[PDB]
Structures are given as structure tokens and as C-alpha cells.
Amino acid sequence: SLPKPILRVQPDSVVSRWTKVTFFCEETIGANEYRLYKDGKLYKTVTKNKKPANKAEFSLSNVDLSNAGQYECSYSTQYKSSGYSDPLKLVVTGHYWTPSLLAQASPVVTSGGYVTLQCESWHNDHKFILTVEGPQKLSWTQDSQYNYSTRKYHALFSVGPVTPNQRWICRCYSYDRNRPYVWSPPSESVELLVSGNLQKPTIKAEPGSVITSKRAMTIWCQGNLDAEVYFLHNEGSQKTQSTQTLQQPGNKGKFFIPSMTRQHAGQYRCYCYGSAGWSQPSDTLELVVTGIYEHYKPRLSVLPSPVVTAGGNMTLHCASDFHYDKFILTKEDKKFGNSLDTEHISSSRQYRALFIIGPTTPTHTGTFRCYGYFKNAPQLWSVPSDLQQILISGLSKKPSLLTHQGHILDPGMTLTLQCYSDINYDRFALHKVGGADIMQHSSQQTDTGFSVANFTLGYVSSSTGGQYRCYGAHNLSSEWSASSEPLDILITGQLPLTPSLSVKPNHTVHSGETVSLLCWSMDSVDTFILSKEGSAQQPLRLKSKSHDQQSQAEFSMSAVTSHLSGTYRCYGAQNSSFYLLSSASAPVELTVS
Numbered sequence: 001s002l003p004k005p006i007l008r009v010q011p012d013s014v015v016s017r018w019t020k021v022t023f024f025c026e027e028t029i030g031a032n033e034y035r036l037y038k039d040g041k042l043y044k045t046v047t048k049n050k051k052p053a054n055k056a057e058f059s060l061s062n063v064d065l066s067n068a069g070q071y072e073c074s075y076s077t078q079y080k081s082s083g084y085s086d087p088l089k090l091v092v093t094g095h096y097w098t099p100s101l102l103a104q105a106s107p108v109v110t111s112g113g114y115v116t117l118q119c120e121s122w123h124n125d126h127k128f129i130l131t132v133e134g135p136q137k138l139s140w141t142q143d144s145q146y147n148y149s150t151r152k153y154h155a156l157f158s159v160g161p162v163t164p165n166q167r168w169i170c171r172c173y174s175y176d177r178n179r180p181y182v183w184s185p186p187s188e189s190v191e192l193l194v195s196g197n198l199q200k201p202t203i204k205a206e207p208g209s210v211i212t213s214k215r216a217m218t219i220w221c222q223g224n225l226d227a228e229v230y231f232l233h234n235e236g237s238q239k240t241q242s243t244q245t246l247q248q249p250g251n252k253g254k255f256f257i258p259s260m261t262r263q264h265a266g267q268y269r270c271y272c273y274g275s276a277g278w279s280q281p282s283d284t285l286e287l288v289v290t291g292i293y294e295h296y297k298p299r300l301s302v303l304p305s306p307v308v309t310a311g312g313n314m315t316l317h318c319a320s321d322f323h324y325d326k327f328i329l330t331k332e333d334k335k336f337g338n339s340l341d342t343e344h345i346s347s348s349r350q351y352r353a354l355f356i357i358g359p360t361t362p363t364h365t366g367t368f369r370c371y372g373y374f375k376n377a378p379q380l381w382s383v384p385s386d387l388q389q390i391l392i393s394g395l396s397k398k399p400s401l402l403t404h405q406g407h408i409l410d411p412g413m414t415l416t417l418q419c420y421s422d423i424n425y426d427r428f429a430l431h432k433v434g435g436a437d438i439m440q441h442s443s444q445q446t447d448t449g450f451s452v453a454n455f456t457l458g459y460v461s462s463s464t465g466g467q468y469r470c471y472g473a474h475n476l477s478s479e480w481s482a483s484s485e486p487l488d489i490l491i492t493g494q495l496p497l498t499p500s501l502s503v504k505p506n507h508t509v510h511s512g513e514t515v516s517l518l519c520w521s522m523d524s525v526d527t528f529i530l531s532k533e534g535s536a537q538q539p540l541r542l543k544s545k546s547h548d549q550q551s552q553a554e555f556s557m558s559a560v561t562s563h564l565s566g567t568y569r570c571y572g573a574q575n576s577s578f579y580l581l582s583s584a585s586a587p588v589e590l591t592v593s
């Protein structure tokens with residue numbers, strides 16, 4: 001007879017227990033009386049007098065379980081009651097057991113498609129309803145099925161067709177047949193990610209793609225500014241929702257991780273939703289967590305030398321006593337190369353990995369660290385090995401070494417090595433033959449008009465004796481210069497044997513004489529060495545033939561001069577150790593007129 005009224009509710013039709021709700025009856029015709037019906041029975045009646053208005057209110061303060069049911073509104077003017085508004089289901093939650101909700105495969109879905117969601121609840125004979133948080137409340141009703149293989153009771157829903165214009169947030173409910181108006185508490189907020197058809201977002205991790213465990217990091221998803229909410233997801237499944245993003249400058253979805261654990265590694269992809277619709281997924285960014293398996297640290301060696309010339313073969317050796325599956329090399333803190341299988345060696349009780357690089361390009365100069373990991377956890381790595389640095393020389397002027405503070409040293413003296421060159425190199429490097437450590441320093445500008453590098457070594461010990469080389473390069477240049485001809489550092493006071501010295505001619509010779517001098521030892525000595533106080537030159541090393549049981553060596557001097565004040569001491573050495581000298585000898589001062 002009259003225009004049918006309209007029924008509105010605030011908030012939405014599904015309300016939790018002990019929460020205030022308000023019905024509104026809407027019309028603009030007349031207001032003689034309003035009637036609220038519950039399940040076809042007169043529940044309440046409101047009269048608009050004793051202040052006249054246009055729309056009626058019904059407050060159900062603190063809703064309980066009995067308030068759930070179908071509600072309708074009617075109104076009367078004069079003496080004519082006008083039909084019924086379309087019914088409205090008021091549902092209340094509680095009393096029951098909370099279900100769980102899972103994506104059977106993944107929430108990723110192509111636009112205009114369907115996804116399968118498994119809801120799980122422990123009630124035997126229950127009907128299940130899957131709903132979405134949207135304007136048009138879409139519902140799905142299914143029965144409980146139990147797979148004999150899985151030995152579990154649960155239902156499945158095919159949601160769709162997933163349109164890219166609407167955001168999809170799914171929630172599951174379970175209810176008894178004979179009590180339909182009372183549902184279970186809502187399950188987890190399961191949101192779907194739609195592979196849209198718009199512009200791709202750029203993804204980054206500013207601390208890096210390889211992070212040691214227990215540390216913090218950030219992930220940025222930037223892109224089209226049509227977006228409102230940003231998401232992150234993994235193939236090893238995660239879902240993270242960021243609705244309010246950093247506005248300056250522009251929509252940049254920031255995600256923060258305070259400490260990396262097992263679940264935080266894997267392949268990440270940013271998804272995006274906006275007013276125009278969903279977007280194509282981002283490129284796959286692999287996040288790696290190291291630090292786990294913090295007991296058996298791997299060890300890294302290099303063959304043949306940590307410094308190689310351009311155009312050679314270089315073998316890196318990553319080994320460990322522990323049964324890892326694969327090893328991976330990292331230049332700087334970034335990736336390089338690829339993974340290789342471990343190899344159980346019978347003799348050395350080791351698990352080995354042999355990384356081949358040939359030829360050696362100047363780009364290989366860097367800081368390599370090898371990690372170990374397993375096949376079933378490709379992103380969970382071991383502890384970084386003690387790093388191995390690599391330098392490559394070849395083409396430029398040789399930077400000769402000053403090698404000051406003498407050529408032979410007794411323990412313990414403070415040794416320094418200065419490295420100079422004609423070309424104004426901005427950076428110098430030092431390395432000992434047969435070693436694994438390399439040293440680098442920035443050159444200072446001297447008064448002469450070129451660059452020199454100051455190198456401070458520690459206490460001269462048994463190990464400091466050997467062969468040393470230096471290299472030079474510019475600030476921008478990645479190619480290093482060929483080394484200088486080798487410096488031989490010698491250590492005395494190491495062998496128990498002690499020689500002595502003599503000369504043949506007179507002490508006060510004229511400046512044109514010849515002077516042969518001799519030092520021998522009754523014990524076995526292979527080579528002998530002559531040393532002068534402050535000898536800037538390399539000392540001469542001579543072979544030993546045994547006259548009697550004593551081992552000796554003559555040092556001849558031809559065309560002597562007064563510039564040579566004299567030769568003072570003699571040392572010994574053997575073929576067993578070419579650079580480790582014996583103790584000092586009796587000094588002998590010479591003079592030349």
C-alpha cells in the first residue's frame with residue numbers, strides 16, 4: 001500500500017558477543033509508528049511523539065546469544081500497515097571452537113580465476129560458510145568432508161572469479177544445522193593476492209640480499225602510485241599486509257624485520273593493489289640467512305697464490321669437517337659464481353669443494369668468503385669462513401721496495417717496509433710469498449713528486465723471514481701493476497750454530513788491493529752470507545765446500561775502495577731453510593785508504 005521501508009544496521013550484520021548494535025528503519029513518507037519484527041513476531045515498536053523525525057532507531061545494547069535471527073521492519077501511517085522490508089540475518093559469534101583457514105596451494109591467483117581454500121574445524125556435523133570482507137557480501141556454503149589419507153575433517157571452497165578491481169579478504173565460519181543463527185568465531189584473516197595486469201613494482205632490500213642471522217633489515221616495494229595497500233609473500237608461504245605506507249616521496253611500502261630467523265629467508269615477491277586494480281608481481285628477490293649452523297665454520301684456501309697474473313688458472317678450496325650439501329662463494333658481501341656439490345674425501349676426513357676460475361680477469365680482485373648449506377634449505381647458510389682476499393697484477397711499472405731498516409734482522413726488531421714508484425699511484429699493496437694475507441694502504445704525496453707507502457710490521461719473529469712483493473694502483477683503476485723484483489727478508493738467531501770471521505791481507509790496505517775473507521763452522525752448514533753494518537745492498541750468499549770436516553766459504557773482494565768502510569759479520573744457513581739464518585759472528589773492522 002505504501003513504499004516499503006529500508007532496514008540498515010550498524011555495524012555489519014555479523015557482530016561479536018557483548019557489543020552494541022543499532023538498527024535503523026529508513027523512509028521519508030510518514031512516521032505514525034515503526035515496528036521491528038524478529039522471525040515473524042513483533043519484537044519492538046517505536047512511536048514518533050512525546051520528537052517527530054523521519055527515521056527510527058533500535059539499540060540492542062550488549063548483544064547476547066538469543067538476539068540472533070531474521071529481522072524485518074514495517075511502519076504504519078493513518079491506519080495502513082505497509083508490508084515488510086527484505087529480511088536481515090543478525091548473527092552472533094562465540095561458544096564454538098575457532099576454525100583455521102588455509103590456502104591449499106597459495107593465495108596467488110590470476111585475475112578472473114578461482115582459488116581453493118581449506119577450512120578446518122573439529123566439529124563433526126557442521127556446515128561451513130566462507131565469506132569475504134566487501135560491499136557485496138559473497139558467501140559459500142559447503143559440507144564437511146574427511147579424507148581418509150589425511151585423517152582430518154575439513155571443507156574446501158573455490159573462491160572466484162577473482163576480479164582485479166576488488167580486494168579479497170576471506171573469513172571462514174562453522175555452524176550447527178539446527179542452530180543456524182549462531183556461528184563459530186571467525187577464523188584467521190586470509191587475504192588473497194591477485195596477479196594483476198598493470199605495471200610491475202620494483203623490490204629492494206637496502207641492507208642487502210644476504211643477511212647474517214639475528215640482525216635487522218628492511219624491504220622496500222615501490223611502484224605505481226595508484227596503489228593503496230602493499231603486500232609481501234613467499235613461495236615458502238607468508239603474507240604481510242601494509243595498508244598505510246610512507247607518503248614521502250610517494251607510495252613506498254616499507255617492511256621491517258628486527259631479527260632474521262628460519263621463516264624469514266626465501267624468495268620474496270611484492271604484490272600491489274590500487275584503485276585501478278592489482279598489478280603484475282615483482283621480480284623474484286632471494287633473501288639468504290647466514291649464521292645458522294654456528295659450530296663447524298668452513299675454511300677457505302687458494303691455489304696457487306692469492307696474487308696471480310692476468311691470464312692464469314685459480315682454484316679456490318672450500319672445505320669443512322661437517323656434512324654440508326653445497327658451498328657458495330661470495331665476493332664482498334654479494335653473490336658471485338654458483339653453488340657446487342660437496343665431496344666426501346676418504347683420507348683427509350673432509351668435505352671438499354673446488355671452485356675453478358680460468359682465466360683470471362682483473363674483475364676477480366676482491367674479498368671472497370665461502371658458505372655452506374643444504375639442498376632442502378637453499379636459503380639457510382652456515383657461518384662465513386675467515387675471509388680470503390684476492391689480487392691480480394700484470395701490466396704497469398714495477399713499484400720497487402725501499403726495504404729500509406736493513407736487509408737482515410735479529411729478533412726482536414721493529415721492521416717497516418716502504419714501497420715507492422715513479423707513477424703517482426693512489427694505493428699500494430704488500431704480500432709475502434707463501435702466505436695468504438695481503439695488506440693495502442693509501443699512498444701519501446711526498447716532497448719529491450711521487451707517492452710512497454709506509455708499512456709497519458710487528459715484532460720480528462721466526463715467521464717474518466721470507467719473500468716479499470709490492471703492487472700499486474690508482475683510485476679508479478681495478479687493474480693492479482706488476483710486482484717489483486723480490487725482497488728477501490732474513491732472520492738470524494734461529495739456528496743454534498755460531499760462526500766467526502777472518503781476513504787474509506792486512507787491515508790497512510790501499511784503495512786498490514784484493515781482500516779475500518773466510519768464515520767456517522765445524523758443524524754442517526750449506527751456505528754462508530756476508531753482512532755489513534747498514535748494508536743497503538743485498539748480501540752475497542755463497543756455497544760451502546768442506547776442506548776438512550769444517551764447512552767454509554771464501555768471499556773475494558776485487559777492486560776495493562775506501563767507500564766500502566768494511567765488511568763486518570758472517571752468517572750461515574742450510575738448504576733445509578733458505579731464509580732462516582744462524583747466529584752472528586765475531587765482528588772485524590776493515591779500513592781502506
Ligand SMILES: *[C@@H]1O[C@H](CO)[C@@H](O[C@@H]2O[C@H](CO)[C@@H](O[C@@H]3O[C@H](CO)[C@@H](O)[C@H](O)[C@@H]3O)[C@H](O)[C@H]2NC(C)=O)[C@H](O)[C@H]1NC(C)=O
Binds near residue numbers: 452
Ligand atoms: C713513513 O715512514 C718513514 C720511516 O723512515 C718516514 O721516513 C723519514 O725519512 C726522513 C729522510 O728521508 C728521515 O729524516 C731523517 O731525520 C733524522 C733526524 O730525525 C736526520 O738525522 C736524517 O738525516 C734524516 O733527515 C725521517 O726520520 C724518517 N722518519 C720520519 C718519521 O719522518 C716517512 O717520512 C714516513 N712518511 C711517508 C709519507 O712516507
Ligand SMILES: *[C@@H]1O[C@H](CO)[C@@H](O)[C@H](O)[C@H]1NC(C)=O
Binds near residue numbers: 426442443475
Ligand atoms: C683515493 O681513494 C682511497 C679510497 O677511498 C682513499 O683512501 C684516498 O684518500 C683517495 N685519495 C688519495 C689522494 O689518496
